[PDB]
Amino acid sequence: NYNPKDFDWNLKNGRVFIIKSYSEDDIHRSIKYSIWCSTEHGNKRLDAAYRSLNGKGPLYLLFSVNGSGHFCGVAEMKSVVDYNAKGKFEVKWIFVKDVPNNQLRHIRLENNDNKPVTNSRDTQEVPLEKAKQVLKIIATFKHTTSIFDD
Amino acid sequence: HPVLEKLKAINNYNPKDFDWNLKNGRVFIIKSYSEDDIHRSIKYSIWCSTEHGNKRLDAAYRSLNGKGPLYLLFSVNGSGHFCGVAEMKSVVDYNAYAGVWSQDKWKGKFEVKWIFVKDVPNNQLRHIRLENNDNKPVTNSRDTQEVPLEKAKQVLKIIATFKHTTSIFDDFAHYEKRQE
RNA sequence: GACU
């Protein structure tokens, strides 16, 4: 299933990034087929990050549709980028749940002009200690809506 | 990326030969809460600090004249590493607005030449603790905090040698479009 | 609101 209760994020030596999706379609498509597509530049940031980690740590992605006013899940990146068509990479969705920004607005990114983690753009990175705070709020939160509702 | 390949050519980044000069030079931590600003500074070879930091960097530079290099050790707040070393190359123009940084508030400008561009994790330098702070580790520094000669040698050495695995260039294309 |  999704939304595990016992989830050890294993963040110690990972990195964590914000994904800003252009459409709820892409979220529906990503979940069904365990891939994601970013812009040319953001894919490429993600490729170097992932490859840099070389499996010493996870690379998590926090999804929010543009204008949705909530976060809509977390997935781990599972492959280098594939440029055989567009660039694609595999993702394993771990949490599908609607987390409203009101619950996360108070966390500011001291790497991005102290803007709230909810005021990020695509592939904005979340510092390790703010990511622990974010992911824990996402993990334990009791959602009433979900992208599945659509 | 063609832009980065101009930069890379004119600038021998991460040189393996660095005679750090020093032994008459003076060294400061630079902190940024915008990595966009670190990408902007590498491109445009300029930096700007707070009004207080501008005055501190200006004063050290001017008391050196050219008898000693002023090196700047950059690191983004919350990033868990330093991201590169640059030399201060001019006095401070306190008037300029530049309009390059990710925030308008930054008044002023001075030239830098970026030398090393590499991510050095904090735990490679946590042991060097600055007596001129309150014996906090150099990783716990604020912006324009001076590093004494003898501890800057230790810090500069580890940055020169460290086999880095990431760099801000890994994100060149990402930060470049964030200028639009 | 250019500390960790």
From Swiss-Prot, chain A:
Superkingdom as given in the UniProt entry: Eukaryota
Upper classification of the organism: Eukaryota, Metazoa, Chordata, Craniata, Vertebrata
Post-translational modification: (Microbial infection) Proteolytically cleaved by HIV-1 protease when incorporated into HIV-1 particles in a nucleocapsid-dependent-manner. Cleavage by HIV-1 protease probably ensures optimal infectivity of the mature virion.
Subunit details: Interacts with CNOT1; promoting recruitment of the CCR4-NOT complex. Interacts with YTHDF1. Interacts with YTHDF2. Interacts with PAN3.
Record site feature ((Microbial infection) Cleavage), residues: 126-127
Gene name of the record: YTHDF3
Cysteine pairings via disulfide bonds: none
Recorded family membership: Belongs to the YTHDF family. YTHDF3 subfamily.
Induction description: Following heat shock stress.
Protein name: YTH domain-containing family protein 3
